[model samples]
Target: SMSVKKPKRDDSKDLALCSMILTEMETHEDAWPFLLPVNLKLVPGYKKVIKKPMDFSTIREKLSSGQYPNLETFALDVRLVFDNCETFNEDDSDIGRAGHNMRKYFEKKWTDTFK
Candidate 1:
């Protein structure tokens, strides 16, 4: 008999979730600079933390109200954004790390709260 191991799960679910939030923010023309690295670079403005509590509250309300636990809710955006954003240089210590970390924090919280 051969031993088998379970396949590892991926961050795809988390990234897919993040993509929804990104699309929601962008669709409303409310894309904040710090939300994700549209273009991650070191600059004076890029270093600023730009989210408000209401920002998160609004996002939570929007997602949780209608789209909770449904990965297909933002299907198109999820595919495009998550696939494209795989290029983000999350190794950098400044803006790259900060933006990536912030997005991850949001992604994780959203999954835990609603998924």
Candidate 2:
């Protein structure tokens, strides 16, 4: 008789890798802008413009709390940070440039580590 196979739910390795990536991202030189949640008071209308704001610290907390069920979900939140930045700042602006740099660094690291 033939038997069906199922994918395992084990995510120990994925969690470890995600933790490492978060550390690297936090230490990145261009990580300043995305280290924490955006200051709504300082950047007026940020809450209105960005429906969902994300950042490295938030991601870290989520990871530690085991909120991310899979790596893809985690990756999506990371991308959200950069996407929000692009939507709010000009490409030539300092924050915008930093977001671009941080995104590039993350993509490279992600591909190298996972792909």
Candidate 3:
């Protein structure tokens, strides 16, 4: 019998995308206001865990501490943060537009050749 081995996933691009979006969320006053309210719902119990408004900087800490076991976990959590926003009109809405912008940057600047 032959056994197949799974290739290890490279998480650099995923981490970078998370960092980029988090940085944007941190710097934009409007984004912060919009996100601070919805973030608790997006990641319920996060406040209980972190004991404060979800801070973008803690993602790296959480990642390093293995709160997220895979790159996809981290990325999808970030995506859900975007997803939880009131799109109202898909990319035509303000929140939706910001979501699109983040996704666009990720697709464009993701530096991985394979994943």
lDDT of 3 by residue, 1-115 (tens): 2687778766656655656655655565445423444355676555555433333455556755768766667665555555544332256766677666655554444334223
TM-score of each: 0.30, 0.90, 0.48
Query: In model 3, how large is the Cα lDDT of residue 72?
Result: 64
By lDDT, the better pick of 2 and 3 is 2
> Which candidate, 1 or 3, has the higher TM-score?
3
Error of 2 at 110 (Å): 0.8
Candidate 2 local Cα displacement, residue 82, angstroms = 0.4
Off by over 4 Å in 1: 1-90
| Cα shift from native, residue 49, model 2 (Å) | 1.0
Regions more than 4 Å wrong, model 2: 1-3, 6-11
lDDT of each residue in 13-66, candidate 2, tens digit only = 999998999999999889999998998889888978799999999999999998
Candidate 1 lDDT tens digits, 5-59:
6876554565456556555445433234333444326533423432211233344
TM-score of model number 2:
0.90
